[PDB]
Amino acid sequence: ATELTVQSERAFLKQPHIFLNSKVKVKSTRPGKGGRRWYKDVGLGFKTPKTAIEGHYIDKKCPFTGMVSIRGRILTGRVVSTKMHRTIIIRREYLHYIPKYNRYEKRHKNLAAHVSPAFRVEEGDMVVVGQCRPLSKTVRFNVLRVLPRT
């Protein structure tokens, strides 16, 4: 994503419990221990993108470098709207079966998910999302992977 500045707000943005003002300098491989950027692994065969570990953005809702755990259903869909800030709308299509006439009909539903600044998402792309705790009035899913374009 494209973000002009990291600190552009009333308060100071920082990861909680990451101490940044130490007199002695010690170099360590651990992410959060030494005083450098913290990140985790979601699991379920999902790989951390390179942009997350080396980026400077601060986000408390991103599945990477954030305080949200992913558990529950995993769904797929196509994005139809990307005109909010860090939020997208996906469309899911399926077929309902009418027993009397022995044939199906088309139906669809709309879903809202949170998109992290690590990914770059455009209209008409397929994405994979995972369930999380309620983050808003109508946001209960988080973007995990962006499939390659044709």
Place this chain on the structure above:
Amino acid sequence: GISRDSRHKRSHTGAKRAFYRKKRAFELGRQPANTRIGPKRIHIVRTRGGNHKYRALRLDSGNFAWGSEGCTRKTRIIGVVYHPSNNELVRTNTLTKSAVVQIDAAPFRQWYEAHYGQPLGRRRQQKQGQVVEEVKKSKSVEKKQAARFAAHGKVDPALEKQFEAGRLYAIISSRPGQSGRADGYILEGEELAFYQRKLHK
């Protein structure tokens, strides 16, 4: 009383919902308590499950911890100087979480004098009104103190200037309405430059 349910809202399609049931014992809310700087005054409240919470109405002192050094001393709060959310919080001198305040620096300076055998922030030498020396009752202490001073290092100039006046900047990191205590830490480093630039401009 106050309720925090979502029944009274409007659905995401714009439709208006209908009445479902009367208000429940849960989903309630309570009147906010506005903490102020003054003599101590605290009320008890009986919450869910038989537990208790502590409403703080007026406070004047609390714990503040120095990050780099690692000491925690109790001191008093002089006044509120900045609040990222609302200006009326600053003017009223009412304190909540993430409020920048000013605290007395006397307890922290004294510990530095004992731990390190060097003076910290003394420009009264021009007046020399309160200059005084007490004979140090040992000689092994210089070996111990000079080792500490040469190892840990020196304070940065930004924090040293505040010690001359005797006032230090801090941020409240507790929730006085919930726990009834005002606690925080001394802010320093890059975070100091952000607030100092914002405070006077």
Place this chain on the structure above:
Amino acid sequence: ARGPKKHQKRLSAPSHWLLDKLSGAYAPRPSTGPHKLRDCMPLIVFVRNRLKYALNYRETKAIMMQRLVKVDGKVRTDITYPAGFMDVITIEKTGENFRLIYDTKGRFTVHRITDEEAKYKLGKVKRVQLGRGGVPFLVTHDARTIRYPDPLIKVNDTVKIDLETGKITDFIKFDTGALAMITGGRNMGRVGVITHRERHDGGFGIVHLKDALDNTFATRESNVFVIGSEKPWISLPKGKGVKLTIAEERDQRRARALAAA
């Protein structure tokens, strides 16, 4: 609904209790305890409905007040006490001991045991972790917690309990080739040997078993209960859980009847 429930309606009681639909409107409603309400064995049902020692409700509690019957070596005095799998019931005055174990039809049955076998138990382990002060501990399937266990013991295994001092004496790992008994599902009461196990990340792993007659069946991991490697430690009931089909059952039924008479 403004608090917790305290009544149980007949026709809603667990099916495996074998309760007649007439003669009353309510059911014993087992009290809270170590075992789940859905799958438990209330003491009144065992004493009155299976052993038929007590005629009715009034005389069932007369026996209990005399502290004649005890479970796991400690006397219990409430008629609706939830008993469960592997529990040992001892009546000293009459002089026999019982162990609660499923048959091949998915219900509890009476099973005599010898006095020598009535002094130990075994249970599945639920969790292992560090407690207060750094002391390790584990909890079994019947809410027994024991401190300072063997570090080799992990979750899903089974441990032999002294039942007199409450100390672990030997254990069995959970792996292929073990002998297990099912505790939940439609395959309730079957006995088989674990063939291989397949795991799915995100929960609900499954295990494949094999019967003595080369039959095959599968179940979730939460319903498999290892009871031995070979020659199971406890004494299995008659039939050993082989699950004969309906065709063989009527053939055996008439064969047994004519052979006896």
Place this chain on the structure above:
RNA sequence: AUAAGGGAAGUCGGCAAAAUAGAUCCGUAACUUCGGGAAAAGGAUUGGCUCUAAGGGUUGGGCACGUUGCGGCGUGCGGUUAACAACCAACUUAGAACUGGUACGGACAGGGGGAAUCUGACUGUCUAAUUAAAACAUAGCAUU
């Protein structure tokens, strides 16, 4: 100029007088030549004091040579300050706290409204010194 209680019971007839009135924010019917009716009807706010926020102008920008009394030009380039620093200047708009004998367009200035009938389409004109109207004119139409 003012009047207790009543409020057109006075009179050919509400003649005279009273009531409404500035600005900001809500709300607004039948009918219609779709332009209107409309300021329809009908509601709320308004002082003093101490504060907060928003709406502008000017001058400065890195090296490498040559001219000149710390510099003005000749240029040869490169870069787009993740927009900084100093100075200057009037008013218009929005929001919060406190305060009073609940008062505040404090004098002046300043629309009463609604349901219908008869008649001329409208703006315009005439009996100076008793009649300003339904009378005259008008665009449109037709005839010689």
Place this chain on the structure above:
RNA sequence: UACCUGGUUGAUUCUGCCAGUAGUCAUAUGCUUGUCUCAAAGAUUAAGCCAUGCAUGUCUAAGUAUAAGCAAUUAUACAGCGAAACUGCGAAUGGCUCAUUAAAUCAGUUAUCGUUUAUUUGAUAGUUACAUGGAUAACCGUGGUAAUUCUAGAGCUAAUACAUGCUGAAAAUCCCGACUUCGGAAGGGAUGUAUUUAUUAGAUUAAAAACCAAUGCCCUUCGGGGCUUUCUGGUGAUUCAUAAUAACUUCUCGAAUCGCACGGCCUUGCGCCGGCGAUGGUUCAUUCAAAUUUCUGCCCUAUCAACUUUCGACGGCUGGGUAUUGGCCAGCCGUGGUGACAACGGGUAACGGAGGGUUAGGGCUCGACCCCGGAGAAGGAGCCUGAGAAACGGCUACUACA
């Protein structure tokens, strides 16, 4: 049991409807009525109004007995049974009804790494003392009002009611250091648990060296050859479990309680030790749960085609409040969200489901009602106690009846 017949014409073959035929755990009514097994029943119109009676209380050997209580007569503190009254628990379960309600309730299926939990079950907490201090009920006696399960002032006495309160241990860790020969040391303080903030540990899972700075050491010929190395749990996944340091708090808990047995030691002192139960108590686990939450699924109507943001309608951030998440609420900043795959609105003689009736197969129709979930107690709002209530056989106020 996969079934048909009468009726348009002077007569005929068709489309086509009217009538006939059978069932109903589907209601009413008329005539008639001997026996055996089973027994539904003020739902439809009025969730309209109610005289009178009942429907919720509770004691063991084990909380408090000076009943001018009874009974015995082993108890000169009490000792058997035991009214009354204080204290503890329950009264939030049952039972009734279908008024509201059209993605709302509900069904099958997921999550709580987003929370509370009386009780039950299993573990678990070393910091005057041979026993601390004031009240009150029952009771005696003196009164008021036409009136109620209304209550006044005076005199006694209890606690498992209310309120105080006692390092009985060491070691180890971290600070200050009286005092030198400069290389360690006299002795001084803190250190259970709960509460609040800041900081640290919580390892990896293929291998061989060579340098700088400089120190536990073994062997030793004093030239030195050198240096093997002790722990670390769990999940698909975390700042998880747990531990250490500096401080904090109108601030907790760590037993001044009760019953049976009658025992063992010698320094024989009204000395010391000792069993089994009852009732409590901090944290973790379990049980009965509760609150939110993922996916898909409801009748007719277009003479309902555009809807939402006055005064939150969609999203970002800092806080407030709640048992916890959340536009649930307060400030500041963006301009979004649903729709012909039927949004929004209007109708329902509409509580949802398991299921009932009728049958070749495919279907049509009903479900107030014994089982599960939700809501209500004449209409609206507010609240106390408590683990749990927005309770009505609990309280406060208005409107309508009385």
Place this chain on the structure above:
RNA sequence: ACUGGCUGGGCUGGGCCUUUCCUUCUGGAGAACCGCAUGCCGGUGUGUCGGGGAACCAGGACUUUUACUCUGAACAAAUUAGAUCGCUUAAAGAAGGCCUAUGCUUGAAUACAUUAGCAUGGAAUAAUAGAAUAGGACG
């Protein structure tokens, strides 16, 4: 009713060669085919012997994506279909039976729901993706 045979004719399935056959590494235990010497009536336990891992188990990596069908798991009692037992028969009920017993013994099965969700085998039918400005594959 039992048993064997047919170069018996069929049905279902599993192995090889035809240009195709079936991903891969680590570890576990261990066979088959092999010889080594010790012993019986041309085969064999020999042994912490070794050339050696069919198959199996556990762990890691790679594999176009949907619909469809098969088999599993999980899911309520009552109801519907349905097995057993002469309540004097029956609608029901879940009981009962045996010589005589101061005793023994049994039953309270099974199928269906069906939309959505979770796994497994099959690969026809109907869609979908890939190397063309090579931005392609391999060592």
